[PDB]
Ligand binder design. Structure first.
Ligand SMILES: COc1ccc2nc(/C=C/c3cnc(N(C)C)s3)oc2c1
Ligand SMILES: COc1ccc2nc(/C=C/c3cnc(N(C)C)s3)oc2c1
Lengths: 61, 61, 61, 61, 61, 61
């Protein structure tokens, strides 16, 4: 019945330095799922499911 | 009945330095799932499931 | 009935330095799951399951 | 009498990632020299002296 | 009388990752020399002297 | 009378990862020399003297 927050961080990404030197980068997909290259990602979910870099093949029913 | 937070971090990523020198990077997918390259990712889930880099093959019913 | 936090860290990643020099990096998937390359990842889940780099083959019913 | 170069690097800096989180940074100088904070610096000198981060006190004659 | 170079590196710095978390950083100089914080520095000198992070007190004549 | 180089490295620094967590860092100089904090430094000198992190007190004549 009382929430007191002060400088409360939750799901926070800060101070990132990235260097990516590459000569080739191919991705060949045939009927599935490919996730690639997620970086410096932050989220907060209340009352629900939270997926960041989620690959699902296929759902057949 | 009383929550007092002060500089409370939860699911926090900070101060990351990354260098990735590569000459080739291929990914060949055929009908499944591929997750690759997740970095400096932070999240917080309340009342739910949280997956960061989750690959699922296929769900057949 | 009383929660007092002060500089309470939970699921925190900080101060990471990474260098990855590679000449080739292939991944060939055929109908399964492949997770690769998770780094500096932090999360917190309340009232739910939390998987970071989870690969599942396939769920047949 | 014949110079053949090919992809010849000399005094080269590449692919640097830096993160510097600091709360205070003071420098107090009284009549001398202070050099601070040189990063990712490259040079090439022909027929002469080359100093990168050089502090000299004082030259009295 | 014949110089053949191919992918010849000389004084080269590459692929550096640095993280420096500090709370305080003071430097107090009184009439001398202070050099601090040189990182990822590369040079090449021909026919001359080369100093990278050189501190000299004072030259009295 | 014939120099054939191929992938010849000389004075090369690569693939360095550094983390430096410090709470305080003071340097107090009075009329001398202080060198501190040299990292991932590379050079090549031809026909001359080369000093990397050299501190000299004072030269009186
Ligand atoms: C025992 O049951 C549990 C389990 C996990 C929990 N995690 C929390 C976080 C609560 C807060 C975070 N920031 C708040 N502000 C700034 C108002 S409140 O509470 C939990 C209770
Ligand atoms: C024995 O005397 C010495 C000593 C050190 C030397 N360092 C060299 C470098 C020569 C070159 C570098 N890149 C060149 N291209 C691409 C034309 S030529 O020659 C030296 C001779």
């Amino acid at each position: 019945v009382l929430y007191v927050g002060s400088k409360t961080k939750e799901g926070v990404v800060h101070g990132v330095a990235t260097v990516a030197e590459k000569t080739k980068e191919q991705v060949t997909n045939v009927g599935g799922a490919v996730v690639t290259g997620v970086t410096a990602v932050a989220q907060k979910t209340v009352e629900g499911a939270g997926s960041i870099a989620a690959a699902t093949g296929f759902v057949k029913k």
